Amino acid sequence: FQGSMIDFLKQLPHLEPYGNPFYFIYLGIALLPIFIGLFFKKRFAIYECLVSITFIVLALTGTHASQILALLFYIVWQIIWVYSYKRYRSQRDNKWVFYLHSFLVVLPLILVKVEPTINGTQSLLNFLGISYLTFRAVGMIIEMRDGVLKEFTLGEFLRFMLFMPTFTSGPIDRFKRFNEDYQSIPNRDELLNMLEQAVKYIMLGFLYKFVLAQIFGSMLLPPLKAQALSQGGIFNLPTLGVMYVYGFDLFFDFAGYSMFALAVSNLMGIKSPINFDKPFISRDMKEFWNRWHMSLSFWFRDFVFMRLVIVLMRNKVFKNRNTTSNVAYIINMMVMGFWHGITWYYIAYGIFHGIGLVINDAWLRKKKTINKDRKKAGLKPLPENKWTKALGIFITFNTVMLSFLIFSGFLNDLWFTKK
Amino acid sequence: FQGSMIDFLKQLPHLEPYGNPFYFIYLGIALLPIFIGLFFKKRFAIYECLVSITFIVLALTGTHASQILALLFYIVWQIIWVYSYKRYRSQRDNKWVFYLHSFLVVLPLILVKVEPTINGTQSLLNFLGISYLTFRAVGMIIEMRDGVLKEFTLGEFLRFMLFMPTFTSGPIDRFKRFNEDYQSIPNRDELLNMLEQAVKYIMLGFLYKFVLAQIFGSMLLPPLKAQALSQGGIFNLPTLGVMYVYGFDLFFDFAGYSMFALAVSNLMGIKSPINFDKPFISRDMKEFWNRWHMSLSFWFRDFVFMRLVIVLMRNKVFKNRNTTSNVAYIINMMVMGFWHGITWYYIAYGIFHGIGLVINDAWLRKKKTINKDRKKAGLKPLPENKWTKALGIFITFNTVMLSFLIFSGFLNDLWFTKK
Amino acid sequence: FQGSMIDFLKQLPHLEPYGNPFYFIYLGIALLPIFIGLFFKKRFAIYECLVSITFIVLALTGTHASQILALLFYIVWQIIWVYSYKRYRSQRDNKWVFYLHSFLVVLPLILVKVEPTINGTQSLLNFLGISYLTFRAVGMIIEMRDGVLKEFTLGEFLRFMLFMPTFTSGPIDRFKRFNEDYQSIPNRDELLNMLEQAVKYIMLGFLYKFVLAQIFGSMLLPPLKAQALSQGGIFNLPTLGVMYVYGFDLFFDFAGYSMFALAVSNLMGIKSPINFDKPFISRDMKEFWNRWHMSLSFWFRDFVFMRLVIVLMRNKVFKNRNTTSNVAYIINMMVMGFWHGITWYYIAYGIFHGIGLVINDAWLRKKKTINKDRKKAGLKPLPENKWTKALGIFITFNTVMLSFLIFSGFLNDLWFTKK
Amino acid sequence: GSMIDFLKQLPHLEPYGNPFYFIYLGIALLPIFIGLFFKKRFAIYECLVSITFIVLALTGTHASQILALLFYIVWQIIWVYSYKRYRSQRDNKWVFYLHSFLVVLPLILVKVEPTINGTQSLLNFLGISYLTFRAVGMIIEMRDGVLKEFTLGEFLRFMLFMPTFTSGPIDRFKRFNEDYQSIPNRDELLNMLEQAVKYIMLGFLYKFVLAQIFGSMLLPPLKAQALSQGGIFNLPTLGVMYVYGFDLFFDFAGYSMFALAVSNLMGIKSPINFDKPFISRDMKEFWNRWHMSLSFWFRDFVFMRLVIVLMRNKVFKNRNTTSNVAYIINMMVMGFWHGITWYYIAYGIFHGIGLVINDAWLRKKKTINKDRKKAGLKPLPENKWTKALGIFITFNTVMLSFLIFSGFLNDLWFTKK
Ligand SMILES: CCCCCCCCCCCCCCCCCC(=O)O[C@@H](COC(=O)CCCCCCCCCCCCCCC)COP(=O)(O)OC[C@H](O)CO
Ligand SMILES: CCCCCCCCCCCCO[C@@H]1O[C@H](CO)[C@@H](O[C@H]2O[C@H](CO)[C@@H](O)[C@H](O)[C@H]2O)[C@H](O)[C@H]1O
Ligand SMILES: CCCCCCCCCCCCO[C@@H]1O[C@H](CO)[C@@H](O[C@H]2O[C@H](CO)[C@@H](O)[C@H](O)[C@H]2O)[C@H](O)[C@H]1O
Ligand SMILES: CCCCCCCCCCCCO[C@@H]1O[C@H](CO)[C@@H](O[C@H]2O[C@H](CO)[C@@H](O)[C@H](O)[C@H]2O)[C@H](O)[C@H]1O
Ligand SMILES: CCCCCCCCCCCCO[C@@H]1O[C@H](CO)[C@@H](O[C@H]2O[C@H](CO)[C@@H](O)[C@H](O)[C@H]2O)[C@H](O)[C@H]1O
Ligand SMILES: CCCCCCCCCCCCO[C@@H]1O[C@H](CO)[C@@H](O[C@H]2O[C@H](CO)[C@@H](O)[C@H](O)[C@H]2O)[C@H](O)[C@H]1O
Ligand SMILES: CCCCCCCCCCCCO[C@@H]1O[C@H](CO)[C@@H](O[C@H]2O[C@H](CO)[C@@H](O)[C@H](O)[C@H]2O)[C@H](O)[C@H]1O
Ligand SMILES: CCCCCCCCCCCCO[C@@H]1O[C@H](CO)[C@@H](O[C@H]2O[C@H](CO)[C@@H](O)[C@H](O)[C@H]2O)[C@H](O)[C@H]1O
Ligand SMILES: CCCCCCCCCCCCO[C@@H]1O[C@H](CO)[C@@H](O[C@H]2O[C@H](CO)[C@@H](O)[C@H](O)[C@H]2O)[C@H](O)[C@H]1O
Ligand SMILES: CCCCCCCCCCCCO[C@@H]1O[C@H](CO)[C@@H](O[C@H]2O[C@H](CO)[C@@H](O)[C@H](O)[C@H]2O)[C@H](O)[C@H]1O
């Protein structure tokens, strides 16, 4: 009964998800049948499972391929605790039972994020996309609590949670929208539109991830970081250079992956949510969060921010609505900071963006009352000319790049600050 | 460049039939056109012949490449002794001529299974599928005897006997059914259903052979064998452990191969017989043999068991039907053991399964008699509760595991008896 | 001037025609637009020229790439001496002008086949397929002489004489049939049938040239020749073995090339004449020549044998028809041997097959008169059964293999010279 | 490290250098052609292909020209939109000249810097000689009012056109937009495909066979012999003149046919550059066949406009003198565009004097033939000998002009440069 099982699942192929461009050959061929079936309004639901599982396994068979075993636990864990809650939802509905089931479903993510802090080493039950899978699972539990979701077969649950195109770190879905878009196969014209969009997305993702991302990450970023460390001090010009370069590199890499995921999802007939829609032209933090990682930000607005606001207003803990909104903004942004990983700089980034949103709300209210005062006094309202827009875009870009500098983790290297 | 032809044959590539998963890619592409051809009403004879011969040669070459020659002669032998009977079938059917033709058809198998016993090491005639090929050949000499087969060209004969997805050790087939199933190409929707079933079979075979068969074969079996040998004695708990582990490994490996073969056959538009249908849950041995190796068990039921019962009743050797049935069961299982190989443990396995079958028949008769006795006495019949079903399943499973342990040959190493 | 263009010609890319399976990928990709255009009843007549010229150049750019220059002379020769007849043909029909034009058109072939005998070195005009282009370039003139051929554009001439699929050494065409097949594009059903036949031919050509031809030529033939030379003497068993092996190798290589050429021609929409149709079941010399290199044998029957018979009968040189037929057979076979090449063994092969045809005609006449005599005398006609047919097949096969032994040129090494 | 050396690291694919480049281009352009078959445009795959091939053609040993290209693109966009915003209000007849000068400023700097101290400017790149002609086009078409609206996509798609980027045929805006927006039907598309295949084959023949023979086999030894003999003139001078002229034609026509074929595979038929020029009887009819795109461009936007400017100011008394001056100035400006050296300007002035002499001879011939018809004498016959004489003299003058333009006359002599 030797425990050489880890060695068994290590010589398997390691086809990287969106690695070399030739990958899109294999997947393309593997997606040739399913897409054809969509033209005839027929869904295989078996060959799709085969291709999804094969590509997930090829993606997860890395140097630390043992993570596959974690998956074979994680899935089971979710299947244990989602369905259990459903059984309870058949009989009764209590706040504490829902809280316990949600906490148990999100527990693997909590362990993966916390264990490197306490023990200092990666947790056993960690794999490539556990930061983007639990968001589906807990989401379904939430959809049970509100009563929107009542019944679903296991095939639907597993084909939703373990979606291949958006598995590693991709757009975050919900169960209602995904299921409704999976049941009703779109007609031929919309299918052809989606095919054209998918080809365009594949080409754009090639450009983003294989040209711009490589240039900004593996060519300028290392020498810029080394020069910044050599300069030393609290701040310097190389710090600004690395801030801007890393911000652009992060955006380009994430947008390239998102385009790849959207293209592959379209090739299966499903319209996954978009992530980035020109986020750097944003002229305000609130508008920025409607552009940067749209799936994640919208998910947190739907399930973490709005529900917290409702809870706070139900108990009327805070008198004015503005104070409740500010508190909920800070809590939501801090929690979003936690999701990346509980360190000093990720939590700093979360609180930073929370403070930014609070300042944005305060400035919106103050601008409204100042416009009212000026209009009442006969003066014209504040100018909306190109100069004001340029100033707003510049301020937003500077704040976003400062946030991406803190989030970059470069402040741990520049300043050896333990906490 | 060649030296001896055997070395040149060894030079040829060796592709294990259903070995690495990558193998399924090759056949997949090799089966891509033909399957599409099944959608329409045409079949590519030349392509099918070429792909079948190519994969047969690839499976036959390797360290024992000379076996290819043993195949070729064998083929001629069959063509020598099948068609001859056909000509004789045109004139008359004397029993002794039919017996002689059947014996000459199955003579290569007799020599292959005899030569290792009674001195010697191994016969030159032996090759990969010789154990599962004569069943097809003697599958026609019998049918000619019954008169249900009259005409067939060489193309049909060799296309059936040299079937590629069922060559190495696959679901034993019959001629009439195979010809009737290949003459009529199935419709489009049935073809899509067959494609889905083939994909499910491929996935399940992956699970059955490359995951669980590996675990039960190369992880637990060697340590359990070592512990059992170290313990010694007539028997011990490690013997029970190795019995259970080997039985599971054998079932999983055989089911994986059979599902692979059925999937590849379905991709060729032909529905080969199913070998395994949920064993280990059978209440009775007689109902176990309708689920374990279904193709071979049904073959022996049709062409060996029932025919022998007819022969015995024609000469009315025994007084009652029950004795004839018992003797037929014993002879059928003994012939199965002989087909497996003429050793001590294979014959022990055959005799033990025959004993199980006859005891099952006797117990069924006794239970029917006692139920009649209770019915005529007014007493409630013996309970058929879930506990009785569990008891029957447990007894059948234990007997099957013991039979597999005997068939393993591990008992021979353990005891060294009858060496 | 420098004269270094030959060196330039040696740095062009090289692609052996039907050399590798990957060559068919390029060929199919290039010919797909032509097939699609055929499906819609359209011929580009320019893209075809481009693909044909590119593949001819890639085939002719071997180690002796200078042969390309010879082609750039040969065409400029043939055109000059084809149209020179066409202008004259409209005016008058003097026999000597036709003889002179035919001789001048066949002159490059005469030089290529003669110069290696006189000077001992390859002639300048020689290139890959002159012996299979002079036939078309003299068939055009012969058709002009009969008056069957009339006004035709240069495009038709150059697309007929320089046909890409049958350029190197392929099926020999005529102009009228090829032109009529080129003008009338076949319907969609015939196009599908031709595509299926072409795929079958490609697979069979793979089997013949890349498997059987290699085995019979590069593996057994050199050892057999070496052992035959070591044995020495006028005749020996290794010589018989190498005779049979080389006969099979020659047939398989030529049939593989012919099937490749037929497939590629079918992909262009025209069906070139077949070359081999089971030559080794001939049962007679006449039925052998109606099966062995059918395009060449039929060409020589149409334009060399029949015309010679007509010439001899017009002047009634010989008293009876049989003498004229025998003389024409001998002359035709000697001229075929000449066309192969002016060596002792090629002329021996030609005159040998001529003697064979003569004695076959004598045997047919004697069998006819003997059957008549036996029928008149009441005796049964001589049997025509399995054994008689087998004896005829054996005699024909032995004579053909002796002919291919003489034609092999092995006699020059064994009998004459020293080794 | 990302530097100029990093730009030099990128692969270099010389435009229309080897047939494998054509295989690459055909494989890349096939989807665009099939899409145009069904009357749709991608506007993204086209941009990616164009940018990729431009970069590959630009990433040579001196690959620092991509920065020059980016600076040129920014400069052209800035000044074109500056004029467009200004044209909406009013035209002052001098702001147009200022904008035209600021648009041609990169070109004039690139053509002046080599001949001022020692070297070309840093902003020079591959196709700057054939790109400015498009930019000024826009400005010209804004002055006449025939162009009013265009987005950035159309403008950059027209200026950064891939098939005619390096030295391909010079286009105009209005025609290019009219041809791009209206995709041709299926049958005309097939005809264009056949013409493109014919162009590819003929370009193969022109550039990869004949140009190689006339450039690498005869030109070096002929130049060597001409230099060895020396003197003002010699028979090897005539040999090198003829060989260089044939090499120039068989190379430029091959490249132009390649560009036209690649453009046709993208559904746009760029203007034909060469239509058998050597058979032209007269000098004036020669310029309608040799470098047709460039000659027509200079006829439309440089010659006729200058004639109009001179006539509206009535500087000269009669039309003939104005036409002569316009011809001389047009040919001199073409010579300047080629490069500011002694032999390019000599070539321009020589072609100008050829044009004016041709005009004068045509007028004199018309007058003398009118007098002959009045006097009863039959007009001079032209069936086979007069036409041959005209063709021969035009060909001789063209060959001499090409010899002067060759720059070999500079090596042969040591005249003041
Ligand atoms: C009704 C009132 C009239 C008032 C007077 C009108 C006068 C008009 C003057 C227009 C000046 C335009 C200035 C921009 C073009 C300069 C052309 C030039 O110099 O040649 C170029 C060659 O041509 C081109 O590449 C583009 C030519 C087209 C220019 C079109 C601009 C607008 C013209 C409109 C009116 C045309 C009048 C005649 C223009 C020559 C580029 O130079 P190069 O590299 O050959 O070097 C020569 C350099 O100047 C010497 O150092
Ligand atoms: C449904 C049909 C389609 C399903 C998928 C079909 C395509 C499957 C491709 C499997 C092979 C991928 O081929 C790829 O080759 C590369 C480069 O050699 C290797 O790549 C990998 O090698 C080994 C693991 O094998 C690792 O140590 C290494 O880090 C990694 O790069 C692997 O062998 C495989 O990842
Ligand atoms: C330490 C905390 C982090 C630093 C925080 C910095 C971010 C603060 C907010 C960003 C600046 C917002 O400042 C200013 O906001 C106004 C008011 O909406 C924006 O103005 C805009 O508002 C909205 C768009 O959302 C429109 O309806 C309005 O017409 C337009 O003028 C300006 O574009 C921006 O210049
Ligand atoms: C490695 C082992 C190699 C040995 C295997 C060799 C391949 C098997 C050869 C089979 C015989 C080929 O010769 C065969 O002759 C028979 C004569 O009826 C015909 O056979 C035909 O029979 C059926 C009857 O419906 C046709 O539908 C079919 O198209 C074809 O198979 C063909 O002409 C040819 O297929
Ligand atoms: C080699 C040594 C022996 C090997 C084992 C022998 C075979 C296995 C034990 C005998 C079979 C056990 O299973 C036996 O058949 C079935 C299945 O539960 C039960 O009985 C079943 O069949 C009888 C037939 O009369 C029905 O009336 C009854 O309703 C049904 O439950 C028996 O009560 C049980 O005793
Ligand atoms: C629409 C038209 C389509 C045209 C089809 C494509 C034509 C061009 C094909 C690719 C170019 C030729 O590709 C060819 O590849 C072979 C690989 O064996 C190489 O050529 C080789 O030829 C022989 C045989 O293989 C070798 O012995 C030799 O050493 C080498 O020159 C060159 O790389 C090139 O000659
Ligand atoms: C319209 C035409 C339809 C048929 C089109 C497709 C048929 C041709 C397929 C070509 C497949 C690839 O072509 C060839 O395949 C062989 C098969 O082992 C492999 O390579 C083979 O040839 C190469 C070179 O000759 C050898 O070095 C090698 O040992 C051998 O295996 C490669 O994969 C590729 O060189
Ligand atoms: C240097 C000489 C080279 C030539 C060598 C020999 C060339 C071969 C030709 C010899 C004849 C063989 O062809 C001959 O055909 C005749 C008539 O069809 C048949 O002749 C045979 O069959 C007939 C019945 O048909 C019977 O009378 C008898 O059994 C026999 O004559 C045989 O098929 C074969 O004997
Ligand atoms: C080698 C260096 C290359 C430098 C960069 C070259 C790329 C430059 C991109 C120019 C286009 C940017 O311009 C922006 O693009 C979008 C999206 O394409 C255009 O959007 C649209 O424009 C045209 C206008 O008819 C449409 O036909 C087209 O479908 C679409 O592209 C907008 O008009 C413009 O807002
Ligand atoms: C470097 C200095 C300049 C070099 C020379 C440049 C001019 C070269 C051409 C000079 C001759 C003009 O060429 C002349 O063209 C005219 C019309 O164009 C042709 O035709 C004209 O003359 C013929 C003479 O028979 C008459 O029919 C009629 O007057 C007219 O048609 C002449 O056949 C040709 O001789």
Short mmCIF file of N, CA, C and O in Angstrom, two decimals, chain D residues 277 280-290 295 331 347 349-359 361-362 390-391 393-401:
data_model
loop_
_atom_site.label_atom_id
_atom_site.label_comp_id
_atom_site.label_asym_id
_atom_site.label_seq_id
_atom_site.Cartn_x
_atom_site.Cartn_y
_atom_site.Cartn_z
N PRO D 277 5.85 49.46 -71.41
CA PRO D 277 6.25 50.83 -71.76
C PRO D 277 7.19 50.93 -72.95
O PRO D 277 7.18 51.93 -73.66
N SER D 280 6.35 52.22 -76.60
CA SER D 280 5.76 53.54 -76.77
C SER D 280 6.44 54.28 -77.92
O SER D 280 7.67 54.30 -78.02
N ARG D 281 5.63 54.90 -78.78
CA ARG D 281 6.18 55.61 -79.93
C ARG D 281 6.83 56.93 -79.52
O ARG D 281 7.92 57.26 -79.99
N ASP D 282 6.18 57.70 -78.65
CA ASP D 282 6.63 59.04 -78.31
C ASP D 282 6.96 59.13 -76.83
O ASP D 282 6.57 58.28 -76.02
N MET D 283 7.70 60.19 -76.48
CA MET D 283 8.03 60.43 -75.08
C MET D 283 6.77 60.68 -74.25
O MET D 283 6.64 60.16 -73.14
N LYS D 284 5.83 61.47 -74.79
CA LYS D 284 4.61 61.77 -74.05
C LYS D 284 3.78 60.52 -73.82
O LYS D 284 3.19 60.35 -72.74
N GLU D 285 3.72 59.63 -74.81
CA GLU D 285 3.00 58.38 -74.63
C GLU D 285 3.81 57.36 -73.85
O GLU D 285 3.28 56.31 -73.48
N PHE D 286 5.09 57.64 -73.60
CA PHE D 286 5.87 56.77 -72.73
C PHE D 286 5.48 56.95 -71.27
O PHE D 286 5.36 55.97 -70.53
N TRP D 287 5.26 58.20 -70.85
CA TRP D 287 4.93 58.46 -69.46
C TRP D 287 3.52 58.03 -69.09
O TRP D 287 3.18 58.04 -67.90
N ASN D 288 2.69 57.67 -70.06
CA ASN D 288 1.41 57.05 -69.75
C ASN D 288 1.52 55.55 -69.60
O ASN D 288 0.51 54.88 -69.38
N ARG D 289 2.73 55.00 -69.71
CA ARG D 289 2.95 53.56 -69.56
C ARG D 289 4.03 53.19 -68.56
O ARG D 289 3.97 52.08 -68.03
N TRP D 290 5.00 54.05 -68.30
CA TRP D 290 6.08 53.76 -67.36
C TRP D 290 5.77 54.41 -66.02
O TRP D 290 5.63 55.63 -65.94
N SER D 295 3.24 58.68 -62.49
CA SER D 295 3.13 59.67 -63.55
C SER D 295 1.75 60.31 -63.55
O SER D 295 1.62 61.53 -63.69
N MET D 331 8.88 67.38 -64.19
CA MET D 331 9.94 66.37 -64.27
C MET D 331 11.05 66.67 -63.27
O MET D 331 11.62 65.75 -62.68
N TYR D 347 18.47 63.47 -64.63
CA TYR D 347 17.43 62.63 -65.20
C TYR D 347 16.11 63.39 -65.31
O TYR D 347 15.43 63.34 -66.35
N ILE D 349 15.62 66.71 -65.43
CA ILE D 349 15.71 67.78 -66.42
C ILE D 349 15.74 67.21 -67.83
O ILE D 349 15.17 67.79 -68.76
N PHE D 350 16.41 66.06 -68.01
CA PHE D 350 16.48 65.45 -69.33
C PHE D 350 15.10 64.98 -69.79
O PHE D 350 14.72 65.16 -70.95
N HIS D 351 14.33 64.38 -68.88
CA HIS D 351 12.98 63.98 -69.26
C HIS D 351 12.10 65.20 -69.51
O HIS D 351 11.23 65.17 -70.39
N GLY D 352 12.32 66.28 -68.77
CA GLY D 352 11.57 67.50 -69.04
C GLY D 352 11.86 68.07 -70.42
O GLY D 352 10.94 68.46 -71.16
N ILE D 353 13.14 68.12 -70.80
CA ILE D 353 13.47 68.64 -72.12
C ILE D 353 12.97 67.68 -73.20
O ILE D 353 12.55 68.12 -74.27
N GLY D 354 12.99 66.37 -72.93
CA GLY D 354 12.39 65.44 -73.87
C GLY D 354 10.91 65.71 -74.07
O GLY D 354 10.42 65.70 -75.21
N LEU D 355 10.18 65.96 -72.98
CA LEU D 355 8.75 66.24 -73.09
C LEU D 355 8.49 67.52 -73.88
O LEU D 355 7.61 67.55 -74.76
N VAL D 356 9.24 68.59 -73.59
CA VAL D 356 8.98 69.85 -74.29
C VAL D 356 9.36 69.74 -75.76
O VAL D 356 8.67 70.28 -76.63
N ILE D 357 10.45 69.02 -76.06
CA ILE D 357 10.83 68.81 -77.46
C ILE D 357 9.77 67.98 -78.17
O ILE D 357 9.46 68.23 -79.34
N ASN D 358 9.21 66.99 -77.49
CA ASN D 358 8.14 66.19 -78.09
C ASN D 358 6.93 67.06 -78.42
O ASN D 358 6.34 66.94 -79.50
N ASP D 359 6.55 67.94 -77.49
CA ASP D 359 5.42 68.84 -77.75
C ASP D 359 5.71 69.76 -78.94
O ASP D 359 4.85 69.95 -79.82
N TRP D 361 7.81 69.29 -81.43
CA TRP D 361 7.82 68.51 -82.66
C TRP D 361 6.42 68.14 -83.10
O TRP D 361 6.12 68.14 -84.29
N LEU D 362 5.53 67.82 -82.15
CA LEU D 362 4.15 67.51 -82.51
C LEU D 362 3.47 68.72 -83.14
O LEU D 362 2.78 68.59 -84.15
N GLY D 390 10.00 55.78 -84.64
CA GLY D 390 9.57 56.42 -83.41
C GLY D 390 9.79 55.54 -82.19
O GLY D 390 10.29 56.01 -81.16
N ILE D 391 9.45 54.26 -82.30
CA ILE D 391 9.66 53.34 -81.19
C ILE D 391 11.15 53.25 -80.85
O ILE D 391 11.53 53.28 -79.68
N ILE D 393 13.61 55.45 -81.44
CA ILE D 393 14.18 56.66 -80.87
C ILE D 393 13.67 56.87 -79.44
O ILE D 393 14.44 57.27 -78.55
N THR D 394 12.39 56.58 -79.19
CA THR D 394 11.88 56.68 -77.82
C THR D 394 12.58 55.70 -76.90
O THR D 394 12.95 56.05 -75.77
N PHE D 395 12.79 54.46 -77.37
CA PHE D 395 13.48 53.47 -76.56
C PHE D 395 14.92 53.89 -76.28
O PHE D 395 15.41 53.73 -75.15
N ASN D 396 15.61 54.44 -77.28
CA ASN D 396 16.98 54.89 -77.07
C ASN D 396 17.04 56.01 -76.04
O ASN D 396 17.90 55.99 -75.14
N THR D 397 16.14 56.99 -76.14
CA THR D 397 16.14 58.07 -75.17
C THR D 397 15.82 57.56 -73.77
O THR D 397 16.41 58.01 -72.79
N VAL D 398 14.88 56.61 -73.66
CA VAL D 398 14.54 56.05 -72.36
C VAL D 398 15.72 55.30 -71.77
O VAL D 398 15.99 55.39 -70.56
N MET D 399 16.45 54.55 -72.60
CA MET D 399 17.62 53.83 -72.09
C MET D 399 18.70 54.79 -71.63
O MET D 399 19.35 54.55 -70.60
N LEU D 400 18.92 55.88 -72.37
CA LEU D 400 19.88 56.88 -71.91
C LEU D 400 19.45 57.51 -70.59
O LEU D 400 20.28 57.73 -69.70
N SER D 401 18.15 57.80 -70.46
CA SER D 401 17.65 58.35 -69.21
C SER D 401 17.85 57.38 -68.05
O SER D 401 18.22 57.79 -66.95
#
